[PDB]
Structure formats: structure tokens, C-alpha cells
Amino acid sequence: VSELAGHQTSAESWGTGRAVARIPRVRGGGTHRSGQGAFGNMCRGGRMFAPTKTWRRWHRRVNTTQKRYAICSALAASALPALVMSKGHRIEEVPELPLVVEDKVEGYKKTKEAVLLLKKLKAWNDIKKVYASQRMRAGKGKMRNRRRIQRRGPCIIYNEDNGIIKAFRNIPGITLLNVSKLNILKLAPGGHVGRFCIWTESAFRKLDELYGTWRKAASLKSNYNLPMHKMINTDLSRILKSPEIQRALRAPRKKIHRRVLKK
Amino acid sequence: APSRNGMVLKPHFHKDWQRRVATWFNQPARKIRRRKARQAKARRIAPRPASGPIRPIVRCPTVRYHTKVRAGRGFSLEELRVAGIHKKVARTIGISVDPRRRNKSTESLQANVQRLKEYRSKLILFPRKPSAPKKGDSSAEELKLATQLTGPVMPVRN
């Protein structure tokens, strides 16, 4: 808010022997404003309590290792059909969830061939869902230029822009992302992992030298290696059903002993 | 009032600091502006090195940093004298010169004259009038080999 707001009144308190509250009052006469409370957060036309200031620390810094970790997690979750379906991305006729297309997509020029590619990749139903989800936002965002809202479509991840950006980008929901400049804000749109991602073959191949293997470090990040699991086998059902675990157990106590009515 | 164990704190906020607060919301804009100015300057001095004149090898002063070597302000007059470059001609071919720096030992002097000689060998001097080359360079090498060097000229390494 303005640092001057509510404080350009020259108002002073009336004292205490005048049967009014001791709030400052506007001076002078001849106008409605005269004798009215001023400067207070409780006063109409006064200053708000603790006025908002521009040095609010709007920005946060996150460790680079944390940010790389989040990118790796989002990429790993984008290859599991349960998580992408749970983000709601209509991957039902998609032939393969890590969906990789040939490099010639990068040189597309018209939007017609981008639409045709999505139709033939069976990713068009997600675009249709975005179309169905276009509606007006509720609240003051309409007054503040966020008038229309829609859901997120597939993310096209490319290696080189030979026209693919212009071929897409008129399809609602589509966001195009360079493989070398992966963004967590686009890979996990709402903070939830599992966005549908379509990879160009060049990007898919560069991915292994970009974040590295577990047995070789990344060649394009100079200190990064993939993070380690604290649980190699997360199949709790298999682990419990395993004979070695079952040999060590005592027998289950599955009989219920309810309260005995004391006769 | 102090409360149990703690650190005796002395905040320097007794002096109406809220009138003099420097926010940094123009930092990305400043980075863009400086980057654009750098690009424009590099375009302006078209084949000349973008970073600027070659700087000398200089040892950092105190006992904490004297094991380290950095780039200096300019080549000394003694260095230019024993390298054979006029002090008023060096600044036109892109050699920075510091008239107030002396040389206390011969090893630094010799390292910097070897630096000057290597730079002078690496230089491609265009003729003043392109049609008529007086003593600048051969057109065969200056037509192809002339490109704008990026980064510092012969960066100083430890």
C-alpha cells in the first residue's frame, strides 16, 4: 500500500474532557471530515494495521541439489501410467507412456501437422479435455487479467527448435520444454507429479548424459549424479510374502476376545 | 528484556532505516541491460576482442594472497620498453598500459614481456585503408582468421 495512505491529515486527539473517544480527529470545520477519527486501523479513511511493504521477501532460494532432485522425481513419475492417469491426462490409447517420437517433429511448421501428430499419437483426447475445461475463473482474477482458466495438456519436450515451438503453442494446454532447460513448474504443474510428457528422440537420448546414470556422472552438469534409493525393493507385498520373512514370524492371533459380561 | 540464555544482540535499527532501503526488484532488469550493452559494445568493436585490452600478469599484494596471480591494470613502461612497443602505440593495438606501476623484480618483468611478445605474435592488424596495406598484415590470413575473441585475452592462469 502507499506509505502515505491514511497519514496526510494533520489530525490530533481532542483530549479527554469532551465526551468522545481519544482517537485523533481531523481539525478545522465546515466539512463532513472535520472531527472525524483519523490515523487508526479502526477509523474509516485511516491507515491499515501494519501496512504492507515492498520488502516482504517474496523470493526463496532452493538448493541446486534439491531442484535437480525434484526434476528427477518428476521425470520418473511421468513414466508411470498410474501417476499420469491420476493427474488426469487421458493416456488410454497412448501406445507407450514414455512416448518418444522421431526427430522430424522438431521441424514442423504448421499447426495442422502438430494437430495431426497428436491425433495419430492418441494424445488428442487430452487436448479435447483442455477444450472442455476452458471456463471463466471465479473471483477477482477476472478483474485482474486472469479471466480465463483451463487445465494442462501434454508437455512436448524437444532438443532443437526447428519450428516445433511455432507449430505447437496454438494448441491449448500444450507447453513446449527444452530438454536442457527442464522446469519443475512445468513438469509438476500444481506441485503434483505425473504430467503427460511427449519426448523427441534427441531429447530422450540427451536425457541420459544430462542427469547421468548411476554408474556414470552427468556429462552436462559437471558435478551431478542421480540420487540414491533408501529402499531398493519397494514391493512390500513381495517382501512380506517371501519365504524368508514368513519363516521368522509367529502365527497370527486372529481370534477376537470381546468383553465378558461378569455374571 | 533478556529471557533466559541467549546472545546479547545489537541490531543497528535506531536510525530511521526504513527511509533508506534498497530493494533489488530491478536486478534482473539490470542484468538484461548490462548484457545488452555488452552485446552492443562487442558489435561496435567488430573484430576487436570483446572483453577489451590484454591485461598483464600481476601478483596479489599481501601475505594472504601473494601465492596467487591475477590480471593487472596495465603493462608497465619498463615492460613495454624492453618488449619494443611504444607506450602511445600500444593503446591503439589494444595493449593496456599502467604508467604508475614499477617492476621490483626481473621474473615478473620477463613473464610480462613474454606475454606481450606472445600477444604481438597473435595479433592480426588490419590495414588502415583496406585497399592499400602498408605494413599491417596479409589479406590471406586477415580475411579468414579474423574473428572476435570472447572472454579475456589470454586469461591469466595460476
Place this chain on the structure above:
Amino acid sequence: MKFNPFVTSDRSKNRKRHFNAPSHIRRKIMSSPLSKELRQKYNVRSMPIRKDDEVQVVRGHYKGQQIGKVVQVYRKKYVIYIERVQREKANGTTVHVGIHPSKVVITRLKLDKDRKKILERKAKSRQVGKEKGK
């Protein structure tokens, strides 16, 4: 979408420009589509509405196939008065009902030197667009 950093997408700014537009660009704002026959005859789609050309109302209460000549272009209220787009008021006199020019189609153009120049300029720009996009 819009990429030019010097044209605004702010709703308040766009509305302010629209409602405080000077009349010489209110003329641009008050353009009408040509009929299909006119859009085939000239390679143009739209045309600023003019005092003495005849239109058909295509939306609202007065829509129909009836051709009516424009009798007024009231740029202050962003409306046009057409010949039979009218109603009786209380005392029995007839008053024109203004409608937006975007809700009419121009069937015949009031043709003069300036109109012909604008028509050929628009057609030439459209043709260079087609040959660029060939």
C-alpha cells in the same frame, strides 16, 4: 497469442481505449462484414460502415432477409440507424432503433473514389498474404 511487448492485454486499458476512441478510429471499430457475394467480388472481408450503403440485420429482434439502407452512423453511441429498423414510441411517432454494425452484413456498398481505394488496398494486402502463405 500476443507477444508484442508494446500492445497491452489489460482489460481496463482495452476498454478505456475503446470507449474513449476518437471518431476517426471509431470508424474502424464500427466495421461490418460484407455479404458472401461482395466477399467474392472483392477480395475483402470487412468494411467500415458508411452512411448510404444497404445492410441486413442478422442478429436480434430485427433480423431477417430484408435489405435496408443505412440512414445514420451514430459514432458516439457506436450504433447505426437503418431505414426500417424502427419502433413506435408512446405518442405514436416512430424512432430509429440503433444496432451495432457488427450485427449487419453490407449487401451493397456506397461506392466512391475513397471506397474503391480502400477496397483495392485491402484486396492487395490479402493477395500478398495468400502468395506469402502459398
Place this chain on the structure above:
RNA sequence: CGACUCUUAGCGGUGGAUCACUCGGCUCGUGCGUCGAUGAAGAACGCAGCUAGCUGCGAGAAUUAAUGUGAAUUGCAGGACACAUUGAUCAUCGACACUUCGAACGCACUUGCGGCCCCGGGUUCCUCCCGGGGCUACGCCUGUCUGAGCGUCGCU
């Protein structure tokens, strides 16, 4: 049985909360970064066919010219406007114009009064009256002209 009073509900008032709207703000950022004796900022008074304010303008006064545009302006009226022996409106704005105070400048002001030089009229050149035009502030630099000094000297 009515009145009266209380509670609740329907309707009607009083009031303007709520909600929805927003040509307004606030905040951040960018690019420029330009006033004035050739008279600024500010003020006053005027100016429209009907006009008080706001806005615009200056006795050429809600505007002239020029250029771009290309048929309106509009609340009413009026009359334009072959749109080519050129054009409504609007925009732009480089030509022209720009009342009185104001640093404010002939002197002075809560009023008023000069002086000088030209021009026209009554005069019917001589200087009175009227009108028009141009000058008439302070400080200061360079130069010019006119000077002052029992200042320092030269010659007689």
C-alpha cells in the same frame, strides 16, 4: 367484546448492508529524461447559436493553417460538405497567432502617472489635443563614445 402491549409470520415502508460489476487507484519494471527575458511555472479575465461547471482555447479565443484520414458532428437548431478547378469529422502538429498579472522589465499599484522617436487625424508644421506603432528594469562581459583626477609622466 374492543383498545393497548409482546411474540411469530405474510405484505408494505424506512435504510442502503450484501453480492456482482469497474474508463480508478496502489505497487513493481522499462525507455526517455525536455522549462524560462524569443518571457516559464502559477494566477486573473475572457472566448461557443443556445453553455453554469469540467475540458479546450486567447480578441484569429470549445480554435486558423498545414499534413494524414476519408463522411460526419449531434442534446436541439442551422448551414454546409461536386469527396477532382479538393473535403465533414477526427488525429497529428512542423506554419501562423498567443489578452492582463507574474523572474515581470518606464514609474506605481487594494489607485494611477510619465518621458523619447516615428505615423495618421483635428492641425492646415508649430506645436497643442486624439488615435496607432516602437522604445524606456536590475546586474554584468566585450567593444564604442563622452568624460574625471593637486594619479604617473612627456612637450611647450
Place this chain on the structure above:
RNA sequence: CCCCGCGGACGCUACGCCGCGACGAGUAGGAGGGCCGCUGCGGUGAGCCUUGAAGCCUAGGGCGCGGGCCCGGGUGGAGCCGCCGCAGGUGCAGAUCUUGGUGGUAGUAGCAAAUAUUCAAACGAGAACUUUGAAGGCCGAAGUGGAGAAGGGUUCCAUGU
């Protein structure tokens, strides 16, 4: 070595479900939970909506210990909400609180300083109050008279409402 039957409830959002035992005061104060509530942002609901959004009203039907919520009817006329996260100028009975509105008081106090009015007529929808006439009174020339300064600034004068 199950087989004339080929068959056999539910469960286990593991942050879930089940069992058993004891216990339950509370200011100042602390903590936890909130599928309590408000506003905005990122996701999501192939969400809702002119065949009717928000808001408001309601002797309507209910749910929850509660904060509150859902549904019916009316009015209204254009936008709104659920879930997962994020962010606050986020919840009022008080502050002789701020601004706005409204009561009782109350058809009450009051419209009581300087003697005083009355008759007839006219105009007019309408007359205690206007106008004319008649009468009775007052100011009583240090005036309730006739003119100015300061101040006001059109109040001056006609015509009309």
C-alpha cells in the same frame, strides 16, 4: 492323493480397521485436531450455470458435541463451488472504538423580551397573516423617520411560479 456339488459373506483409505482397561473440573497459560469459516494463486473435478450463478428471504427437510454445512420454496439476473497444495490486510459484542443509518424520549419541551388589534371588500382552489378602504393603537425628530461610511455583492426593479 478333497471332489455326485468346482463352491464358500465382510475386510486391509495400514494416515486403515479391530479389541481390551482406566479415566473426563478448570482462570492465566501451553499444545493438538478441525471433511470449521473468508479471500486470492498453482493443479484437478471432460465440475456447476440464463432450462437460472452470486447475494438475500424463509412457521420448509435435515446433518454435526460444535465451529458450521447440505437440501426445498421464493426473490434475483451472471457468474460460482468441491478436492490436493500454496499465500494472507482471514472470523468481533464491547475499545466514552470509526463511518453510516435508526429508535424510545415524543406529537413531548417548546414556537411567552420591547402595549394591539378589528370590520368590509378584492384577487384566489384555499385568507388570522397578501392588497385596498375604514377604525383603534405604537415609534414620538437622541424615531420603528430621511440619507451616507465600512461590509455585503445584485439582495435593487418589473413579470411569473
Place this chain on the structure above:
RNA sequence: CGACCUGGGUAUAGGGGCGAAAGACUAAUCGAACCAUCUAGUAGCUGGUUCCCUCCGAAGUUUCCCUCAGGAUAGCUGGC
């Protein structure tokens, strides 16, 4: 009939004026005018401090303090 009353014009301006003196008067303000700002001045003092349920639950005592309407300190409390 007088140290008389009074108009207008002038002069004196705030820690200053003016006072036949009452701390009187100085634009309904005077034992220090009014206006704006420093200024959201400071307050150990008064008033207020906005949703629900569940669980736990005090102190008015010790020592030191220009300390006695306040603090620090130990105690008592809650949470992890």
C-alpha cells in the same frame, strides 16, 4: 470637560509583544497564541484484543534492582 468617548490610518509578533499590573490582553485560545511538520513522539499507566472441540494446567513465593502499579532470577506450567 476629562488621566474623557470614539472611527479610520499606522507601529510593536510568541519565550516575543503590550500591560495605571489582574499573569491581564495578544482573532470565543494565554502561567507562553495559531498553523504545518519532526510524529504513528514516549508511556513500568487505563481501555480493547475477532472460530470450534480435545488434552494438560498455574502464580501471587526466593534473591537482586533509585526496586515498592515494573523487571531480571529461581520456583510452579506446557510442549517436544
Place this chain on the structure above:
RNA sequence: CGGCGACGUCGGCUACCCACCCGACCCGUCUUGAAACACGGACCAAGGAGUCUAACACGUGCGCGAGUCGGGGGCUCGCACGAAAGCCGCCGUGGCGCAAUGAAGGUGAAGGCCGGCGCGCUCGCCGGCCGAGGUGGGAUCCCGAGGCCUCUCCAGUCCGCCGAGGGCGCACCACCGGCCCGUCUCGCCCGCCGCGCCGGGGAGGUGGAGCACGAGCGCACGUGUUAGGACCCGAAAGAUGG
């Protein structure tokens, strides 16, 4: 097991009005004590008060880990989003941590077992090993006599469970030693391109926010304290210029 069931009745403890019995003083607040003859409150609507920054402390979550952190800069068509994100590594400069102690000059954290030698003179020249000592507790883990089995016994095949005792002992705690810096007391040696008013060493007390096989760094969140208008409203005053 019985009765009753459409224009009159059936059920609906909630919700509207009314009646009766019992109970019931007006809230907020300061206070030992408020219904108070204590203060504020006529009524209704809307607004209205622990906030943000910085700095600490501890707790919690995350990443990396003797390291960690790019926050300032730079590179990537300059820019819908994007003022975002990504990258740098001879951009890690630097910060914090990894070393303490003394006013400072300065100094600065490894010991134990087994041998021959001086005199194994409370000990100096070596050797060999091992690599932060020991005592008492100590989760967990290891061994384990002896038992628990089938239709039965003379005789071994493979492992499961209980198990008195015994062992290695995490973290942590108490204690005893040891080491580093300061400072006292005592005392005898050693070193040399500077033989010195030089330098080094030992034993015994004692001062240190120390060592003794690191735990930190960055980010986020909570709480508490503090400087700021500082939860909100409130002086009498003081100053500057008019």
C-alpha cells in the same frame, strides 16, 4: 399376538405460538472479592487490533555431507507465462564448519604391549607390532550345558523354539588416566654456519567457551526473545519553519 387405517385421521422429542412445574441477577473488565450503589455498553450494519523486515536461540522436515552454500556476477532469439527456469567450476572470491589457547609476543591437540642397553637412574638412542586408554553400568547382537517333538524303544541322520550361565559391547552416563594453550613450583638435560640476556625438552598443581576417528552447511516451518510505529487507540510535553 392384537387393533387401526384417505378428504378424516397417522407419525414427525427438532422448528412457530402459548400454558404449567422446577431452575434461573447483566454482559465485558480490573480485582482477594462484581448482580453491584464500580467502569463501558440505546439499537443495527459495515470496518476494527501480535503484522512485516532484520538478528539470534532451540525444535522439526528436506538435500548434500568434512564439507556445504552462488545469495553477487556471467552464459543461454530478450521479454506471453519467463522479472521464471536452466547452466558455470580456473566464477567457491568469500561465508560458515573443519582448532584451540593467551592481553600479547606466540604456541598449538596419540597413545598402549612386548625386548635386549645407561643404573629399564620414575628413565634417554632404537626395534617390533596395534592404532585414541581403562573401570562400572549399558539397548542390541554372539556362544551356550540343559530341555520342548511324533505308535515305542538300543542307534545317528538336518535344521525350529525355551534356555542357567558366558562373551563382544552402540549411544549415553559417572569416574580414573592421557594430550593442547595460559600460568605457577621444582629440576636436570639437549641443539647449533648465528654459542646467545639464543632455542627445545621434563615432572607436579592450576586457569581454558579445548582434544581424545569430525557434524556441519544450505533451505523451509514452528516457537521464544529483541531492534524497528512493532498488537491497536491514548498524554501533559519538546523541536523546526511559518
Place this chain on the structure above:
RNA sequence: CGCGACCUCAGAUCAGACGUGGCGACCCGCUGAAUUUAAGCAUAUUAGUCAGCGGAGGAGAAGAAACUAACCAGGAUUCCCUCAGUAACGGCGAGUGAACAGGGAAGAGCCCAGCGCCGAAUCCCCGCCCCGCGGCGGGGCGCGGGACAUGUGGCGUACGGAAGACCCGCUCCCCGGCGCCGCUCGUGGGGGGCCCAAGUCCUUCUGAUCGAGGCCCAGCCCGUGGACGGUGUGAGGCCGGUAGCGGCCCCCGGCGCGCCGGGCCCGGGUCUUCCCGGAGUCGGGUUGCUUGGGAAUGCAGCCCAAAGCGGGUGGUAAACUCCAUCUAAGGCUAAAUACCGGCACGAGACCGAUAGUCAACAAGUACCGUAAGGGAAAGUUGAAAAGAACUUUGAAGAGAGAGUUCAAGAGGGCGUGAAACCGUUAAGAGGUAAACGGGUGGGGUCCGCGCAGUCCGCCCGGAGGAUUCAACCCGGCGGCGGG
């Protein structure tokens, strides 16, 4: 005993110029508090801050060492990170508090006086002639004035410089135009003007729709354009726009070549001989302020008052000594940096009419005060005025009819239209003021598709239908297992 020259002064409405005042967010020079904190308060703090005065510019100021250091040295200024809440200051209390080195942004250097040499080589003005105008310059002439030896210009400035020799290298400067490029540049350099894709298709909802369903050929059409706004609803295709190294037209500006008109004059190296510097200033004393600067950091007043192998600094006063480092008392200078005023833009996890600026509106307005100054309230008919013709009562306000509209139960302070409060109607009640908790009862309004009251699994019986039930054959697809 006048005329001249100079010096020092004066006047002029003399010829031609220049300053003043405003804005003031940022910047430079001064001046300069108190509230406040210290739980009192005087030093301290607030704070070299507010207020006051002066002066600028698009930036300003600063700035090319009388520097930092003590090292194997760095090298103008300014800004960022860090140094560092540190060294230090401080009733050593509260509190205050830099710098160097290091890493970066940027980077650029120079000119006089003096000492000298060169016949004042120099400058201004006025005339006349030519080339020009776009901010008034070039060239030429003047027995034309003036300035200036009480010092103009050229060389030259601490990094040394000059002059002579000897040797070596000819190497090529800056201005204003004629025609034309690369068309200037992340693909126009800038300003302005006009233009450039695609549904108003079919059926329907509505007052109106931009709504809903559909549009065979893999799907209505365009999409480098699905930003936004308008339009009677909520629109990629109705309109303006949006995208585009899209188009056309006009104007402006610095970039190379041949020529044009003028200026345009020798550079380096070695040796020899010469020449070298800023004074009421430094420095010292004392006083006052200021700083982290502490036996005195800086500034200023007064007094004293220099030197030249000197002088300054070397963070503890002084003497001696060595060393290091710079060269004061003259001047200029871009960039990085600042910007709550101005011109023009863009944006937002902000506010949404008691909010957000005081001001969404004829707001610094109305109004108040003598003045300085103080300073509001106040948004919404409807898609369209279609803003209610006409009849009727009344003097009119105001009504009853009628009419417009989807709606006037939208009627000019007119979207919605809460509560408090009030009127009327309906029901109920009423001598312990109302109101309240618990428990019932009565009445009332509504709810229950209440009104002969649930379904469904198997079996039995009866009365009927129909493919076909099992098992085999063919084919397809899955689950499991396979040395």
C-alpha cells in the same frame, strides 16, 4: 599653460551578448534540532537526520595518487559481493563503527602554470566579395579598429621534457557534400499512416444470444493468429485487433567507395649538452565542530609560519637512524551507479466504492478559517428511452386505469435490496418488567406419493414362452508352468 600618453575610475535607452524565476524524485555545498533510547539524566543516542538556505544535470558528484601496502607487492574514480557487526569509538553504559587485501560491473585517459625556444607565431570585433543558411561556418581582401610583452599561440608537464648530432623508418590525419551500395540491424535504426486467416453453416434455448447438439472423408474452417476488448450471454472464426526474418507509402539520423573545397606536417632509436615545477600554502600551536580514527580522522577560525638530496605519508606522543612510497597547495574527463518529480509505456498470487490515492464522479472541487492552512460526501434504469401516449379525480403534489419492456414487484439518487426501526394483516397470549435453561402438554404451519405398507436368494407346485443346457468341433484372446 595648454596639448598629448598611460593609469585608475565614471556615465550612456551606446553595439552585441549573458544572469535572474520555476521544478526539485535522484545529486552538490552549507546549516542543523528536539521528540526518542539510555527503563531517571547532563556526555552519548536520535543525527550530520527532520526542518531552513543556496546550486545543477539527464544524471550529479568523484576521478587519474602528496594512494594502498610491507608483499614474490598492487595501481584513477564510481557501483555490487565480501571483509564486518570486524579493527576501533563509547557515562568502554545504552549504543556506534569503517578501511586494505580478494572476487566482480565498467574501464580511458589527459591539459595548463612554471623552465625554455620561436621577429605576438596568438585572439576578438567591424566592413566588403564568394560558397552557403537551417543552430550561422569556410575561404579571400582591408595604410580597418581593438586585445595582448603587467605575456597570446605552437612545442612541452613528472610516465620525464627540449635541442643538436648519428642511424632507421615514408609509413598517410581529421572535417562538410556529390551518386551508390552492405540497405543502418536477432534479421526497419527510428518516428508516422493504411492494410493482410478462418462459420454469423444446420437444428434448437432465449427478450437477445457469444449457450446446447451437429458438421462423411479421421474427422466444419483457420491457426507462425486459441492475447485481449467490443457486440442484447458466456465468441479462435461478427468487428477491432493478435501472429508473421508480413506488405505499401512518407519523413528523419550516424555508418565505405571515386571525386569535390579547404586545411594537413616527420616519427622512432642511441649518444652528447641542457631544463625541470603550483606559498599566508605546507607545517606547528590553540579553539570549536566532526570521524571508527583512539596523546587529536577530517574541516574551519585565530596566532606562528616554511623547505628544496626538500616536502607528505608509513593508525601511540617524542629524539636519532635506516628504509619504503608518493610528489600537495592549478584544471578537465565517458562507462558501470542514483532517481517516491516529469513524458510515454508494460505488468501484478494487490484493493474493489467506509476498500484502493484525499480524489473511480464538474476533487485539491464544495465548504471552513483574517491568514498560514484544513478539506469532504458523492459509482450502477434498461439490450434499446422503448423515459409511460391517451382517459379520468384533484388547484397541484399525488392517484386510478391504460401503455413500453422479459422484467417498472427495473419509473431518472431508478441492479440486488439485509438488519435496526415502523405500518397493516393473521394467529396466539397478557395483574408479579421482559427475556432465558430443563421437562412436558395444547394449538398451528408444513413434511412424509402415510392411509391396508418392504424387498430378494433358494427351493416346491401350477400355468406359459424361448433360444438352446451340458458335452464335443473350429477360431480368437488371456492366466499359469516349462530342464
